């Protein structure tokens, strides 16, 4: 049932360390590789920077002819000699705080206007930001691939070489995210037009969905500016769908070019979204890869985890991210392509004692492999560093291969992993709770995000009150997921798109965090789920619209629900819990015919009900609660207990987090203390831990 | 020389604890007061909530006639019986996680639309957010004061009562700030018009400053929408000056009303600004009080500190805030009106082990008094909680008066303070570094802030490149102030407005973080400082404009500086430090006339020089650095060492923070470990080395006699 990497036909925990040969004294390459191997790491990972090896147009140096640290060939040879497998990442983009994000200075100087990503005004967003499908950019990218890919092909594991995986580019779309600015390059706008014609066929069909009044597709312009009209929302929603196709087109062109060199090893991509030590926006970024993941089962996505610290302040971020990657990529192991080791920024400390706990928490939270980023600090050669001379701090090794505090933490965690990996990789948690992942709520990187600082989406202007980013960030990520993890209830996440009814029926409860909009297919799926005997918890709204904000009341009508939206005090009572704070004045007030009222406004109007439908059960709450009070934990706890769902353990201290992982033979109990407090507690089936620390217990069943 | 509270003509450390009588079973009031007293606290502090005591319109209960916890009179009497002095805070606003911020439900339902803060379009911003100078709001506030102030007057210290201090309202502007929208109520509009007429006298004079073409004052309105022209910036700048006069009018009106009841006690106000455990926006909010602090010597401002954790991520916030309060209020002690105890919200933990370190660091960082907020947990009666039933968590006492973990941390800190207060209160740090506080860079709460919904200020639209908010957050607060604290260099902050040359000349260095604009008065002061023998460090720009973005080249001319602004790589070299990352592509390029070039762009153009001017020294850097790399700390250290300023101690671990406080008699060494690492290090005084071992997120205090 579990997905995991395999070596010598056994479950293998992928332990990789990032070591940038191009940033290290080549005399010490062997020393770095030996010290990495001595931690029990099996793999080393590196960029192969285009800028570093194509020193001038059509002048390539992979042999150190012009600088010893250009000797990629010798670095590959050293990986083989020190019996490390190799992950290679030749771009074209690498980011990696490298000048021009890894693009050659000569290329950027020489490219035309509209090789670059453009704002609505036709101006360059950034002198290092190309348009992915620029003919110029792909021409030069292909010429780079023409030189680096034969080297990679020769040394690939399919030729019994050390190279086991290759990453395509780096964090596709990360610059549309960081600037909020969409590419308006005329090439992209033309592709968007083709995308729309293909999707709707006639202007009458599009007009019918958008309520527009185009005489033809010729009158259709890429959406820009703030959303004032539902037609604007519609045009931006399809612009989001278009960018998912665009990115799939980009990664497909790179992959096809790569396969033409006979490279048959595993291809990878890496997911950004952590900032300031939380990952509440990472689900938006992973949503941008929805078309890649459905069209390329041979590309393994890994997470870029940057927790910065390890506390109750961010404990939920890594589990929610792991669970969502599992939802969107169920046929491949959950792993971290970049797994924080040291810190990218001197002023943001990364403590060994923090990261050691993060590493163990990551095993509790289902991680199956990782690449310590950065294992080895680097020194940027001759002004190639974006931000300073030094690349990372507080790593396992400094750029001269001196051991730092993190080295012993990584050695201890790696020794645990190697001792347990055969059993641990085949364990899962027992989730009786499923939480729905409705991807369209996440499709907002161009109109609403933590990094886009002028919001184009204001749902009040559209006659709506539930903003999908507020819903997915505060009610879902920091709310329900944080609350279940705090309460030590196992959950799984499931992608609701093309979702199999049979993959929902194994769970005792399905939780759906719903805005006022939800497509007919998902409304139908949830109707069928309850009618066939599923238990659905739904809030804060029964949806009444589809993704284009056109009437769709399938779930509402199938469940016999009637409501009026009414203003009341922020606080409600729910299951006898008084003073439950809710996010909105506006609440759904439900007709209670054939229903049990279980929630009430301050004026005793019914804002939640329970009902039987066919063989199933429905709980609807017409109000939005996150986790900002003890009442929120009580409410989540009462809801879970409606279907008699039990924690795996009774633990005397409710502030201790635990994860029970088991298979037929083995149990691991992970205890995690996310608090600045020495805690002593006891447990039993349904010990002292230092601050910010952990304890792992094994049971034979 | 130090400013501190006094009792019996001796230095006295103000130790208060917040205990909300209205959220505690009144049978347990005495037990809460006795346990607070037993920590060595001398004072107890509470809100008197309007909503709680005016139960219906013109129906008042201060005696527990309708609910026993309405017996304010009894709570006051118990404070006296238990030998605690009492701070009272009767609003009208209290916030305090209380429904409607403490205003009565009946009031908010009765008030007409013009009582409320309104947006650009005339819509109510929030149903609990009044316009401060609303006739209706101030009428109801006066009727609330008519009933609560006689009780406070009768129980003052001068009538042998326990009441020693009273807070006026609560964090003026905090509610506007958190809503993300500014007040365009018609009272604001009309008072603004009167302000502009009084300020400019004629439309010709306004037009000459703004470069506008208005025919009359009737064509001019309070600015709304984004800043597109310099004239819009000018309109908003005057709007910022107006809001400071507006907040002074509000507090003057409350204060005058209070004094009429024969209330002679110390009046206080409390400063907001911490959010998510840092305080980089607090200097903006304290800046909104500039006119209150210059007109009311008798109102003492205290800080509301909410660190949430104690680590390198936020180590610099409390020191910078304490230093900025001192700069704006130099004649009163630095103190915390709200000093985090427990957590206001269940999902944000407050660990006793963090807060104990915060309390010690606060002593290191010059705090002279505080009010533990919250000392006692409460339970909201009758659904009065804004957010839930329970008021605070992980406090010193639970609502029942059981001791929690934090109680022992507070007793330990207070014991040290009571043993040491007579010396410790009279100690200072030796600050050879002064940092300039230029308040107009902070005047952006209407146009640019972390909380404002609309970004109205885009300086590139005005032909500028140095954003005043970017400068004051990243170059000063998170940059220079953070770097100096991290490097263990003592600094003072001095307000440059009406600043005495004599109060700058005691320092070895004055550091000025400058934008492209600076008023004539400040340009002239810094010019005279250097000519008379001062050592000035100025970056990232020689200013060439005044506060209205009109030509002002006083400093540039007095310092004999020629420059051109040119684009280059973000990286510069400075004092032989390569690959110093800087915020902007645009840099000032100086010619080398009568100067030593000390910084170069990637094309080897001069972006920094060192010069002698009269008897003084000038170092100017034509580029912007905060603290985002090791090069930044190296550069700050090099600049400080230009005038041979030395740390008080050699410490073997650069990541240990220390403060040395001394007087005549005593030296205190504070060691602060803001890191999740057990650290074993040695130190010595910089004028045989002692070895110290310190836990994660911990502290050591050494006292020496002499
Ligand atoms: O910067 C570190 C490392 O991270 C990867 O990109 C980061 C991304 O994960 C993150 O969400 C954002 C915002 O915090 O910063 C970076 O984009 C990247 O693949 C690596 O090259 C970087 O070295
Ligand atoms: O919320 C806790 C207490 O804090 C004060 O107001 C804070 C303010 O200091 C802070 O900057 C903002 C954002 O974090 O939140 C406000 O609540 C109040 O004066 C107290 O009444 C309140 O209980
Ligand atoms: Ca799993
Ligand atoms: Ca019905
Ligand atoms: Ca001082």
Author numbering:
A (entry chain B): 6 to 691, 702 to 716
B (entry chain A): 6 to 692, 698 to 716
What does the paper say about this structure?
The IALB_1185 protein, which is encoded in the gene cluster for endo-β-1,2-glucanase homologs in the genome of Ignavibacterium album, is a glycoside hydrolase family (GH) 35 protein. Here, we showed using recombinant IALB_1185 that this protein has glycosyltransferase activity toward β-1,2-glucooligosaccharides, and that the kinetic parameters for β-1,2-glucooligosaccharides are not within the ranges for general GH enzymes.
The overall conformational change on binding of ligands is small (rmsd, approximately 0.2 Å). Thus, the wild-type (WT)-Sop2 complex was used as a representative structure in Figure 3. The fitted Sop2 molecules in subunits A and B are β- and α-anomers of Sop2, respectively. When the GlcN recognition residues in the TkGlmA-GlcN complex are aligned with the corresponding residues in the WT-Sop2 complex, the Glc moiety at the nonreducing end of Sop2 is well superimposed with the GlcN molecule, suggesting that Sop2 is bound at subsites −1 and +1. These results suggest that Glu343 and Glu176 are the nucleophile and acid/base, respectively. In the WT-Glc complex, Arg349 participates in substrate recognition to give a stable conformation, whereas Glu102 is still disordered or flips out as the ligand-free structure. Contrarily, in the WT-Sop2 complex, the Glu102 residue in each subunit clearly faces subsite −1 to form hydrogen bonds with the Glc moiety, suggesting that the side chain of Glu102 must interact with a Glc moiety at subsite −1 to face in the direction of subsite −1. In the complex of wild-type IALB_1185 with sophorose, the electron density of sophorose was clearly observed at subsites −1 and +1, whereas in the E343Q mutant–sophorose complex, the electron density of sophorose was clearly observed at subsites +1 and +2.
